Design an enzyme around this catalytic site. Structure first.
Site, PDB file in Angstrom:
ATOM      1  CG  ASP A   1       9.688  22.918  15.210  1.00 36.20           C
ATOM      2  OD1 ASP A   1       8.739  23.513  14.637  1.00 36.20           O
ATOM      3  OD2 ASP A   1      10.448  23.505  16.013  1.00 36.20           O
TER       4      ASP A   1
ATOM      5  CE  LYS B   1       4.423  26.840  11.422  1.00 31.33           C
ATOM      6  NZ  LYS B   1       5.318  26.270  12.475  1.00 31.33           N
TER       7      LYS B   1
ATOM      8  CD  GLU C   1       4.355  24.657  15.668  1.00 28.94           C
ATOM      9  OE1 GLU C   1       4.542  25.701  16.314  1.00 28.94           O
ATOM     10  OE2 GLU C   1       4.406  24.585  14.423  1.00 28.94           O
TER      11      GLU C   1
ATOM     12  CG  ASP D   1       6.218  28.043  20.842  1.00 28.92           C
ATOM     13  OD1 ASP D   1       7.262  28.684  20.545  1.00 28.92           O
ATOM     14  OD2 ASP D   1       5.853  27.018  20.219  1.00 28.92           O
TER      15      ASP D   1
END
Ligand code: ADP
Ligand code: MG
Ligand code: NA
Ligand code: NA
Length: 381
Positions: free
Chosen positions: A7, A68, A172, A196
């Site tokens: 991850d 990211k 994800e 999430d």
């Protein structure tokens, strides 16, 4: 060799390995099961993960994070232009592509987002090798479901640069559903809501899973809401308290604020399993100790609007997927912030009492599913 699941998170990354019938999430040198997605450059060295985050206040312009948010994007992207105003490090334009620019061993140097992410991936690879005692090359790496092909390709490229063989880039929410075996239930379709709430981002995804197809029905959320916001509220709370108690405003003392922030983040985590938390900081400011506490109720109060607000993207996701609450088979908690009891209560209440999938540590669920997929793709499952 062993194939791993990684991850590569906006704020924290996590590596797991499926072996001997189970997933092991791998602790780093400091014993931490997740690692900050930070890279820092100094007069002598490059630091990655815990060591990089740990020195941020003393070296802010050469300490890089949020790669990211840049990966797979162009410099003139509205998102890139907007995000840049909140980073202490320089972002520069190289022939259309964004690059982070830093000082390193006394020279000016620049790096593409996928180079920075390659360094975080190198660290995750090393973490796995330290535990396994074996060379790690094969990996499944995850990305948000809304990532486009440029973002997926750049994430894969980050892996390649780190010497990883990226078996596949998977979503994800798909990884989370895989972790819980929601694709293996005896039945036809299953409607799954992935909730999430991470360190810097909030992602709601609705998947309809059938015949090994993880159809993304809808996504929603807030790319700039996460645990960091809750920490911010706590930090402001205590800065105000210190001002009242001592007639000192510590705000522009970067090291003092950072030490307070660290204490707040820790207290927050503690409040997920206890009704109160101690704040203990020696010599916060001018040798003045800061020892106090905060109750779970006060933490919840400080964040009440933000917590309640997570439900709005859930309604939006449902509407866009054309599903009633009652049509959701499975609700899955992902991201460290979903450990917050108040968040769990809000979400369960929203689903009128329905049980939540949360037996897998939510900050580990993505890595867990990626590890399972890696085993499948390497023929070890
Ligand atoms: N027990 C906990 N209670 C509340 N927040 C937590 C807990 N553990 C981790 N967090 C928070 O989770 C966030 C990191 O989420 P994570 O999912 O690990 O990262 P990312 O969103 O980068 O994938 C941080 O804000 C961290 O403080
Ligand atoms: Mg995450
Ligand atoms: Na993560
Ligand atoms: Na997230």
């Amino acid at each position: 060799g062993p194939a791993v699941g990684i991850d590569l998170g906006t704020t924290y990354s996590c590596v797991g390995v499926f072996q001997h019938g189970k997933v092991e999430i791998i602790a780093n040198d400091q014993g931490n099961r997740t690692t900050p997605s930070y890279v820092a450059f100094t007069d002598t060295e490059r630091l990655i993960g815990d060591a990089a985050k740990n020195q941020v206040a003393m070296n802010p312009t050469n300490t890089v994070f949020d790669a990211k948010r840049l990966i797979g994007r162009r410099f003139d992207d509205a998102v890139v232009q907007s995000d840049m105003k909140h980073w202490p490090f320089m972002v520069v334009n190289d022939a259309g592509r964004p690059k982070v620019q830093v000082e390193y061993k006394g020279e000016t140097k620049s790096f593409y987002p996928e180079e920075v992410s390659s360094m975080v991936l190198t660290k995750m690879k090393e973490i796995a090798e330290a535990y396994l005692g074996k060379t790690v090359t094969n990996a499944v790496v995850t990305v948000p479901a809304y990532f486009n092909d440029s973002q997926r390709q750049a994430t894969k490229d980050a892996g390649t640069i780190a010497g990883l063989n990226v078996l596949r880039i998977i979503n994800e929410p798909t990884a989370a559903a895989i972790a819980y075996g929601l694709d293996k239930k005896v039945g036809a379709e299953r409607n799954v809501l992935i909730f999430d709430l991470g360190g810097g981002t909030f992602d709601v995804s609705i998947l309809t899973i059938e015949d090994g197809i993880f159809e993304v029905k809808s996504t929603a959320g807030d790319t700039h809401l996460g645990g960091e916001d809750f920490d911010n509220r706590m930090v402001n709370h205590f800065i105000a308290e210190f001002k009242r108690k001592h007639k000192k405003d510590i705000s522009e003392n970067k090291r003092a604020v950072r030490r307070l922030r660290t204490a707040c983040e820790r207290a927050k985590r503690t409040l997920s399993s206890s009704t109160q938390a101690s704040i203990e900081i020696d010599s916060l400011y001018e040798g003045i100790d800061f020892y106090t506490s905060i109750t779970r109720a006060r933490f919840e109060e400080l964040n009440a609007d933000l917590f309640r607000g997570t439900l709005d993207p859930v309604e939006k996701a449902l509407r866009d997927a054309k599903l009633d609450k009652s049509q959701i088979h499975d609700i899955v908690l992902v991201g460290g912030s979903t450990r917050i009891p108040k968040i769990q209560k809000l979400l369960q209440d929203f689903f009128n009492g329905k049980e939540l999938n949360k037996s897998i540590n939510p900050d580990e669920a993505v890595a867990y599913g990626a590890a399972v997929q890696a085993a499948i793709l390497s023929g070890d499952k």
